[PDB]
């Protein structure tokens, strides 16, 4: 209901964790689980690749269809670009429905 593709077997969940590395234990045995760990984090790169199938537009319509367009008029910032401070923004929602068909 929010949108997209319903899937019985969707892309699986990918779960990641830093393996705990404990600090030095007491040197005399204790049954209690070790609560003292070395503070750690991890970084890296993630790459994802999707292949999408397209359904081409066969329409025989004569007059030109509505398209998604960038505004021609001048502005302080480019839409879908970083600003002076360096942060990226998306100025508007872009839906997918522009070309037309007959019922």
């Amino acid at each position: 209901l929010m949108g997209g593709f319903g899937l019985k077997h969707p892309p699986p969940q990918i779960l990641i964790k830093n393996t705990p590395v404990p600090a030095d234990p007491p040197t005399t045995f204790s049954q209690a689980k070790l609560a003292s760990f070395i503070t750690q984090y991890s970084t890296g790169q993630v790459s994802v690749e999707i292949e999408w199938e397209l359904q081409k537009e066969n329409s025989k319509r004569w007059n030109p269809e509505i398209q998604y367009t960038s505004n021609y008029y001048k502005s302080t910032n480019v839409d879908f670009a970083v600003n002076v401070d360096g942060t990226y923004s998306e100025p508007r929602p872009i839906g997918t429905r522009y070309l037309t068909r007959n019922l």
Partner: protein, 104 residues
């Protein structure tokens, strides 16, 4: 097979988009009058009569007519022209095919 009661052609008008090329065919109905009563005539304009030297000419008008498709809207529709201009950096004509048929 050429005869009075059988058509010598069909109406082919549409475009097809294949990869790096597009093929636009178009069919029209025309009417050809007799021009100049089957005569050649020389035509000219001099300076006499208030006309400028810049507009003077000499030539001939012929009984013949001519087919000209030199404008893009002949070949492309407005929807096809939109597909072209929005999706492509450039285009050039490769080849041509012409037909006259169903002549009354």
């Amino acid at each position: 097979a050429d005869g009075v009661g059988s058509s010598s052609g069909n109406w082919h008008c549409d475009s097809t988009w294949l990869g790096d090329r597009v093929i636009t065919t178009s069919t029209r109905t025309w009417a050809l009058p007799t021009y100049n009563n089957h005569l050649y005539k020389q035509i000219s304009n001099g300076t006499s009569g208030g006309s400028t030297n810049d507009n003077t000419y000499f030539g001939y008008s012929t009984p013949w007519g001519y087919f000209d498709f030199n404008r893009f809207h002949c070949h492309f529709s407005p929807r096809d022209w939109q597909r072209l201009i929005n999706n492509n950096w450039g285009f050039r004509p490769k080849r041509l095919n012409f037909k006259l048929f169903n002549i009354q």
